[PDB]
TrEMBL record, chains A, B:
GO terms for molecular function: actin filament binding; actin monomer binding. This is Twinfilin. Keywords: Actin-binding, Cytoplasm, Cytoskeleton, Repeat. It is found in: Cytoplasm, Cell cortex; Cytoplasm, Cytoskeleton. The keyword Repeat applies. Actin-binding protein involved in motile and morphological processes. Inhibits actin polymerization, likely by sequestering G-actin. Coiled coil: none annotated. It comes from the Eukaryota. Belongs to the actin-binding proteins ADF family. Twinfilin subfamily. Interacts with G-actin; ADP-actin form. GO terms for cellular component: actin filament; cell cortex.
Length: 138, 138
């Protein structure tokens, strides 16, 4: 199966333990999930949700590991959101690979890590508006 | 929670109401944010941004509450910058403490206080050149 890259695990654990950034965008490259981009963000979780919209590329699946304001006692870090942008027009092989590989985050980083896993197919499924819409139906 | 010291609150409110002084450097000691240093500065906001580089200590996290010349109608005072110097070589515990505590300033001093929150990890993220770099990235 596709595994998280060592670099992605290291950067995640660093951001989780240090609280010193907001999100990591990752894509499947070669045999691994690799860092695509890192957003420092701010102390404002709500404002930072909208920064995701600047990193998504229409029609290209990507993951965003988005740090919440809730601490995780188990890891002495934070709870996260797993945002999976898997647009419907992506080829079936790529949609199946991104959909099936979602589970690798909790298995690799720990079951306490993710408060929510949010599957979206359009940019408007994300940002602050998209998050509030997800919460209304979770 | 981590709370601002009474001395820090009072000095901030005095500088906000009088315009007497340019910035306060603050550090977290016990569970309190304390004054580390005060810079009187000048009438030149732009030039005074470089004075921050004289107070940062390489590898030691600190905050700078930096008074702008922009009016805050809400407080009959000024808009401020929250500069957070959180270098990567700081202990994970200290990076987490300084990262997680950023929001305490707006919560305590008032939501209208800060024009911008600027996170940096190296001296070149600050000064006049670092502020211009922040503004250019918007």
């Amino acid at each position: 199966a596709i595994e998280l890259s060592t670099d992605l695990i290291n950067k995640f654990k660093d951001m989780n333990s240090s609280g010193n950034g907001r999100f990591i965008q990752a894509t499947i490259v070669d045999e691994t999930i690799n860092i695509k981009a890192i957003e420092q963000g701010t102390s404002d979780f709500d404002a930072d949700l909208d920064l995701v919209l600047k990193y998504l590329v229409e029609g290209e699946p990507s993951y965003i590991l988005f740090r919440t304001e809730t601490r995780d006692d188990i890891t002495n870090g934070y709870k996260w959101l797993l945002l999976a942008y898997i647009p419907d027009r992506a080829k079936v092989r790529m949609k199946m690979l991104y959909s099936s590989t979602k589970a690798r985050f909790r298995t690799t980083l720990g079951g306490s890590t993710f408060l929510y896993e949010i599957h979206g197919t359009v940019f408007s499924d994300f940002g602050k508006s998209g998050y509030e819409a997800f919460l209304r139906h979770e």
